[PDB]
Structure 1
Amino acid sequence: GRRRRLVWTPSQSEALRACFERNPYPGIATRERLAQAIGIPEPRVQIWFQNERSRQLRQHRRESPEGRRKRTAVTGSQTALLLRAFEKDRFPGIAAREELARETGLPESRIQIWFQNRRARH
């Protein structure tokens, strides 16, 4: 099961596109400011910038550095909890990831990244 898909308002689409036009590689501060200005969680903004670059690069392919998020600290206790879940299921859905976010205290978007990285390496 995946998270419920958002639908942009015209005002949100305009703000996303205008910020993309200024810089298609925003850092965490730009993404957080834009997220709050338009009322959308920052991970959804980051996912949109990724999809929009893919749309623009593909269309350019047949027509033709801002600061990163600070490294999330993961305690040994949080890691062991994620590892136990990973051993049972490597592809948790949104509800399983929200459970892990609740139990660990980490943002669900960091849980999602943790599982993507772990699958690539183990």
Structure 2
Amino acid sequence: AVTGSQTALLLRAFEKDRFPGIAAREELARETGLPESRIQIWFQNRRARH
């Protein structure tokens, strides 16, 4: 699971760039302190639900 702060940051990103490319995902990884693969999973999962 990701933290509340990470969720808030990722959701705001998702609502501006719904399909981040690898550079954007690596940047979100650095912003959040999450691995890039975890960023990708989070976006894939959210899009599969929406």
Normalising TM by the smaller chain, what interval? over 0.9
Deviations 1:1-33 (A, max 9, x none): xxxxxxxxxxxxxxxxxxxxxxxxxxxxxxxxx
Q: Indicate the SS of the match to 1:88.
A: coil
TM-score by length of 1: 0.40
Structure 2: runs of 5+ lacking an equivalent: none
- TM-score normalised over the length of structure 2: 0.94
Provide the identity percentage.
100
Task: Measure how far apart 1:120 and its partner are.
Answer: 1.1
Q: Which has the larger radius of gyration?
A: 1
Query: What is the rounded CA distance, in whole Å, between the counterparts of 1:90 and 1:121 in structure 2?
Result: 13
Deviation (angstroms), 1:89? 1.1
SS of match in other structure, 2:25: helix
Alignment of 1:53-72 (within 5 A): none
**1-structure distance, mates of 2:33, 2:43:** 16
C-alpha deviations, 1:45-85, integer Å up to 9, x for none?
A: xxxxxxxxxxxxxxxxxxxxxxxxxxxx3000000000000
